[PDB]
Amino acid sequence: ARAREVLVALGQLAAAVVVAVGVAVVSLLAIARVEWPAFPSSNQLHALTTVGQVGCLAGLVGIGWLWRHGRFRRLARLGGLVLVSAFTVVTLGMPLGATKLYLFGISVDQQFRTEYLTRLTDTAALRDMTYIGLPPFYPPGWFWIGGRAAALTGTPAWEMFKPWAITSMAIAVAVALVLWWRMIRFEYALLVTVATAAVMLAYSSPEPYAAMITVLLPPMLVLTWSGLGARDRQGWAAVVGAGVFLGFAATWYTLLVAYGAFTVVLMALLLAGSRLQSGIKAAVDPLCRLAVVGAIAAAIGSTTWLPYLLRAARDPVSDTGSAQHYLPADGAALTFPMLQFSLLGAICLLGTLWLVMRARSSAPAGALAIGVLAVYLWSLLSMLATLARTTLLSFRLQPTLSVLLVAAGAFGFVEAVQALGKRGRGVIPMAAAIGLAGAIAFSQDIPDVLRPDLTIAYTDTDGYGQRGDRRPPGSEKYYPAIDAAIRRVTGKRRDRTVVLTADYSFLSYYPYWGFQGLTPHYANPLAQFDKRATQIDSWSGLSTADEFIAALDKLPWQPPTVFLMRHGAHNSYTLRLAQDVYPNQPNVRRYTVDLRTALFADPRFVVEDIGPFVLAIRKP
């Protein structure tokens, strides 16, 4: 058919990936050579960020101006890719210029993310983050590539969480730009991708693998809508593209693949219901294309979900503490970003009005309208599914709603300027001035929306026993000695040791296994968190070393061989625990179990005191 334009599209996407990687590596390497002052205790970084993301917006205006008239038409595209990548990198990695940890440091939720990135760094295979022998549940897409990049190029996996997060976000933005200029004109592509990137950097920043899909949802929604409606010879490239995107998101983020599949099913149903006339021959074509999309998606996404569904087909999984047991305050109320007094609220209101008035006679507007409606239906469905003692995690779809509404708002701004620009001549400069002022006023609020994240990132001890605040380190400065003791006693590589700890930040830095994960929610259902916790709590009612060693040789699972406990309450070794009280708000409840210092009394234990911790290792 001589449709080589597919080859050109693949070449453009590969060039986007290469350019984003190059910019995000060079910029970060250059930044990390200056010894900047701490962000929470100096304005040096928050001013250089503003300078950078103003110089990367004036540059975009210049590039868009150049594209309108010029014989180049190719330096404009390269400049656009370079400038969106640089905008993302400067917005994020400049405030984090003196620290080595990502947002939130090693705190509440980064613990298991860093643990899984550390797991997939000393092994190529797919293994669970904590437990031993199990196939992984959480999608190992981002972490596998991060682990390969950290195993190849030196640096430990806790240290390749900031650079790889920023680089992945830059890749997502630079690929979203390539996806937009295939559909709409170049200037509109620049404006829309900059708006969506600026929103994701402010809202889906802490989790740098939901941000990629969050940015790529609008272009892929438009591409699927235009390609599910084609008739009998057209859009078969868009169908395969949407299927590939859903398969890619299956191994990258489960909530967003669920939402995307929901939206695609709604799109196919709406199209099939709409064209129910002209016989049934034309009313089934959207269903055939939906079948093809599903067939590609659940064969690209089965390279990571097959081991789990093969081992969980027979094993007694618990699944009564599922990861979707969060019902926070904002998870019991719909989100209306269109109506909040602020610039984001104004642009979301403009997007809502544009979608309402242009849904029926536009290709992007219809797709974005169906996306927003599916977001709201998903929210209502999760609220209703709380009856079935489960949730659909609808409170993580707020950033997605913001991104969709901001893309529609940029579209509506362009449409309005081009509509009321007929009744006059000097409106493009004034509209550009107002829009640039608004963009500069918003993009300097990114480091201030993320202020708690940056403060936590600057006051957490990294894996070198240092703080990014250049203050005395916390408790994490003893872990090197602890690991040296563990490796000296057992004599086995740290992939073969099972460690029972209460401070789960030891296993984030070091690739030891675990007998109990940090939280009941992000724990493998095959692991039987409840029964492990029951067995652990039973040990509190023991007093003899022989009884304890007999208990440690009767568990169905693999027993701990290294215990990292704390002093407590007149010769008892306290290990803090956790429990899922889901219907209630603090969905997790912490409680303490204590061992009475006589269990670890044999010639078959080696008990040492290192700082506050006591390290009882079972001698081989």
Q: Is the backbone of residue 2 left (phi > 0), alpha (psi -120 to 50) or beta?
A: left
φ/ψ region of 597 (left if φ > 0, alpha if ψ in -120 to 50, else beta) reads left
Q: How far apart are CA 121 and CA 164, in angstroms?
A: 13
Q: Which of 381, 427, 467 is nearest to 105 (CA)?
A: 467
Q: Is 54 in the site for a second copy (CB under 8 A)?
A: yes
Candidate segments 226-234, 283-291, 345-353, 516-524, binder of a second copy by CB under 8 A: 345-353
The entry of Ca ion, a second copy, none that residue 111 binds, CB within 5 to 8 Å by partner kind: Ca ion
Residue closer to a second copy (CB basis): 95 or 260: 95
CB of 308 to Ca ion, least distance (A): 19
Looking at the Cβ atoms of 97 and 520, the one nearer to Ca ion is: 520
CB count, 10 Å around CB of 456? Answer: 18
Query: Could you give the count of Cα atoms lying within 13 Å of 391 in the half-sphere of its Cβ?
Result: 21
Contact indicator for 323, 254 with CB cutoff of 8 Å: no
Least gap, CB of 361 to a second copy (angstroms): 11
Binding mask 363-392 for a second copy (x = CB under 8 A): -----------------x--xx-xx-----
Q: Are 98 and 458 in contact (CB under 8 A)?
A: yes
Residue 440's binding partner, choosing from a second copy, Ca ion, none, with beta-carbon cut-off 5 to 8 A by kind?
Answer: a second copy
Among 107, 302, 320, 444, binds a second copy (CB under 8 A): 444
Assess 51 for contact with a second copy (CB under 8 A).
yes
Instruction: Among 6, 8, 26, 43, indicate the residue that binds a second copy (CB under 8 A).
Output: 43
Applying the rule CB under 8 A, the residues between 312 and 331 that interact with a second copy are: 327-329, 331
Distance CA 546, CA 550 (A): 6
461 binds Ca ion (CB under 5 A): no
From the list 154, 426, 472, 556, which residue makes contact with a second copy (rule: CB under 8 A)? 426
Query: Considering CB distances under 5 to 8 angstroms, the limit depending on partner class, which of a second copy, Ca ion, none binds residue 353?
Result: a second copy
* Residues 543-582, interacting with a second copy (CB under 8 A): none
Q: Which of 50, 111, 443, 455 binds Ca ion (CB under 5 A)?
A: 111
Q: Which is nearer to a second copy, 145 or 581 (CB)?
A: 581
Q: Is 518 in the site for Ca ion (CB under 5 A)?
A: yes
Q: Under the criterion CB under 5 A, does residue 501 sit at the interface with Ca ion? A: no
Please say which residue, 321 or 463, places its beta carbon nearer to a second copy. Answer: 321
Using rule CB under 8 A, residue 237 touches a second copy: no
N- to C-terminal Cα distance for the chain?
68
Residues 56-115 that bind a second copy (CB under 8 A): none
How many other C-beta atoms can be found within 10 angstroms of the C-beta atom of residue 233?
Answer: 7
Q: Which is nearer to Ca ion, 238 or 499 (CB)?
A: 499
Token pair, residue 601, equals: 């009394």
Q: What span, in angstroms and rounded, lies between the C-alpha atoms of 454 and 103?
A: 6
Answer for which of 30, 339, 388, 419 binds a second copy (CB under 8 A) is 339
DSSP assignment string, 174-220: HHHHHHHHTTS-HHHHHHHHHHHHHHHHHHS-SSTTHHHHHHHHHHH
Residue 291: name its binding partner from Ca ion, a second copy, none (Cβ under 5 to 8 Å by kind).
none
The answer to the question of residue 449 lying near a second copy (CB under 8 A) is no
CA 614 to chain centre: 35
Please give the Cα distance from 394 to 334 (Å, whole number).
9
Q: Please, how many CA atoms are within 13 Å of residue 175, restricted to the half-sphere of its CB? A: 22
As a whole number of angstroms, the distance between CA 575 and CA 535 comes to 13
Is residue 253 within the footprint of Ca ion (CB under 5 A)?
no
Torsion over CA of 191, 195, 198 and 201, rounded to 10 degrees?
Answer: -120
Sign of CA dihedral 187, 89, 75, 443: positive
* 398 lines the binding site for a second copy (CB under 8 A): no
Q: Is 489 in the site for Ca ion (CB under 5 A)?
A: no
Does position 578 interact with Ca ion (CB under 5 A)? The reply is no
Contact positions toward Ca ion, by CB under 5 A? 111-112, 115, 504, 507, 518
Q: Which residues contact a second copy (rule: CB under 8 A)?
A: 37, 41-44, 46-48, 50-51, 54, 327-329, 331-334, 336, 338-339, 343, 349, 352-353, 356-357, 380, 383-384, 386-387, 426, 429-430, 433-434, 437-438, 440-441, 444-445, 583-585
